[PDB]
Ligand binder design. Structure first.
Ligand SMILES: Cn1nnnc1SCC1=C(C(=O)O)N2C(=O)[C@@H](NC(=O)[C@@H](O)c3ccccc3)[C@H]2SC1
Ligand SMILES: Cn1nnnc1SCC1=C(C(=O)O)N2C(=O)[C@@H](NC(=O)[C@@H](O)c3ccccc3)[C@H]2SC1
Ligand SMILES: Cn1nnnc1SCC1=C(C(=O)O)N2C(=O)[C@@H](NC(=O)[C@@H](O)c3ccccc3)[C@H]2SC1
Ligand SMILES: Cn1nnnc1SCC1=C(C(=O)O)N2C(=O)[C@@H](NC(=O)[C@H](O)c3ccccc3)[C@H]2SC1
Ligand SMILES: Cn1nnnc1SCC1=C(C(=O)O)N2C(=O)[C@@H](NC(=O)[C@H](O)c3ccccc3)[C@H]2SC1
Length: 265
C-alpha cells in the first residue's frame, strides 16, 4: 500500500512528505498529504516563467535587464557571472528554471510588476489558472524561510500539480510559448537526484526543483512513459523536526518517485 510506504519514508527521513499525481483515464489520482501546504521554494519559477511568457510578445525575451551589486542576495549561479553586462529576459528565464537562480527569479517578478515586487501579479496568474490555494508573498531568499506551518509562500502538491498540468499538457500557453517553458524544464540541471532518479531511463522527465530552510526539498515534473503517455508528479517535503538548518533530503523524493513509478509502470 502506497500510503504505508510514504509513511515509512517520513519516519526514515524525519520528514513530512506530500505527493500528488492527477488521475488519468486509466489511473486513479495518487495522493498523500496532497492538500497540505508546503513552501514553493524555487518550484514557483516554472509558473513565473509561464506568466512572463504569457504577458508579453515573444521578442520580449530579447529585452536586456541590468542589475547591480545590491540585487545579488540569494544563490544565483548565473546572474552573479553576468552582473557587469546584464541579462536578457530569455537568459533570466533560462537561469531561473535551469539553475534556480534567485536573482533571475526576482528580476522576473519585477518584470511582471505590480504590488509586492511582482508577487501579487504572480499569485493572480495562478488564480487565473483556477488555483485558489497557492500564494507568493516574498522574493528570494525570504520565500524559503517561513516557519513550518506558516501559509506565506506556500502551495500544495495538488494545487501545483494542476497548475503544471495546465502549463505543460493543457492550453494555458500557446504552443510556441509552451515549448519554451517545456524545453527549459527538460534541460534542467538541478533535478537528477529527485523525480528523475525514481523513473526508469526510458521514461522522459522534465522538472523544476525547490530547496529551502527547515529541510525543504520539492520537485514538480511531467513524465512521459516509453509509449508517450504523460503523468504529472508533484512531490514536496520538509523536516521541521531538524529546525531551520535541517538539510534537504533529495533521497526522500527519489524514493517517493520510485514508489509512484512502480504504480504507473
Ligand atoms: C543535495 N542537495 N540537493 N539540493 N540541494 C542539496 S544540498 C543543499 C544546499 C547546500 C548544502 O550545503 O547542503 N549548499 C551549499 O553548500 C551551497 N552552495 C552554493 O550555495 C553554491 O555553491 C551553489 C549553488 C547551486 C549550484 C552550485 C553551487 C548550497 S546549494 C544547496
Ligand atoms: C513533450 N515532448 N517533447 N519532446 N518529446 C516529447 S514526448 C512526445 C509528445 C507527447 C506524447 O504523448 O509523447 N505529447 C503530449 O503529451 C502532447 N502535448 C504536449 O506534451 C504538449 O502539451 C506540449 C506541446 C507543445 C510544446 C510543449 C508541450 C504531445 S507533444 C509530443
Ligand atoms: C540525528 N543524527 N544523528 N546523526 N546523524 C543524524 S541526521 C544526519 C545528518 C543530517 C540529516 O540530514 O539528517 N544533517 C543536516 O541536515 C546537516 N546539518 C548541517 O549541515 C548543519 O546543521 C551543521 C553543519 C556543521 C556543523 C553543525 C551543523 C547534517 S548533520 C548529519
Ligand atoms: C542544484 N544543486 N546543487 N546542489 N544543490 C543544489 S539545490 C538546487 C537549488 C534549488 C532547487 O531548485 O532545489 N533552489 C531553490 O529552491 C533555491 N533555494 C534557496 O535559495 C534557499 O534560500 C536555500 C538554499 C539552500 C538551503 C536552504 C535554503 C535554490 S538553492 C539551489
Ligand atoms: C558546486 N558543487 N560542488 N560540490 N557540490 C556542488 S553543488 C553545490 C553544493 C555545495 C557547494 O560547494 O556549493 N556543497 C557543499 O559545500 C556541500 N555541503 C554540505 O555537504 C553540507 O551542508 C554540509 C553538511 C554537513 C557538514 C558540512 C557541510 C555541498 S551541497 C552542494
Amino acid at each position: 500500500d502506497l500510503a504505508d510506504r510514504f509513511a515509512e519514508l517520513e519516519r526514515r527521513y524525519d520528514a513530512r512528505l506530500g505527493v500528488y499525481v492527477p488521475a488519468t483515464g486509466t489511473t486513479a489520482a495518487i495522493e498523500y498529504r496532497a492538500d497540505e501546504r508546503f513552501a514553493f521554494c524555487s518550484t514557483f519559477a516554472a509558473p513565473l516563467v509561464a506568466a512572463v511568457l504569457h504577458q508579453n510578445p515573444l521578442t520580449h525575451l530579447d529585452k536586456l535587464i541590468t542589475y547591480t551589486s545590491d540585487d545579488i542576495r540569494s544563490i544565483s549561479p548565473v546572474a552573479q557571472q553576468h552582473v557587469q553586462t546584464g541579462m536578457t529576459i530569455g537568459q533570466l528565464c533560462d537561469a531561473a528554471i535551469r539553475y534556480s537562480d534567485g536573482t533571475a527569479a526576482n528580476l522576473l517578478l519585477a518584470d511582471l510588476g505590480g504590488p509586492g515586487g511582482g508577487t501579487a501579479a504572480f499569485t493572480g496568474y495562478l488564480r487565473s489558472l483556477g488555483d485558489t490555494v497557492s500564494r507568493l508573498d516574498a522574493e528570494e531568499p525570504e520565500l524559503n524561510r517561513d516557519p513550518p506551518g506558516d501559509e506565506r509562500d506556500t502551495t500544495t502538491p495538488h494545487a501545483i500539480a494542476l497548475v503544471l498540468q495546465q502549463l505543460v499538457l493543457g492550453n494555458a500557453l500557446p504552443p510556441d510559448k509552451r515549448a519554451l517553458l517545456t524545453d527549459w524544464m527538460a534541460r534542467n540541471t538541478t533535478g537528477a537526484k529527485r523525480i528523475r532518479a525514481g523513473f526508469p531511463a526510458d521514461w522522459k522527465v522534465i522538472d523544476k526543483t525547490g530547496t529551502g530552510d527547515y529541510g525543504r526539498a520539492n520537485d514538480i515534473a511531467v513524465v512521459w512513459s516509453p509509449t508517450g503517455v504523460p503523468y504529472v508528479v508533484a512531490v514536496m517535503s520538509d523536516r521541521a523536526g531538524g529546525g531551520y538548518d535541517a538539510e534537504p533530503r533529495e533521497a526522500l523524493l527519489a524514493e517517493a518517485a520510485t514508489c509512484v513509478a512502480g504504480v504507473l509502470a
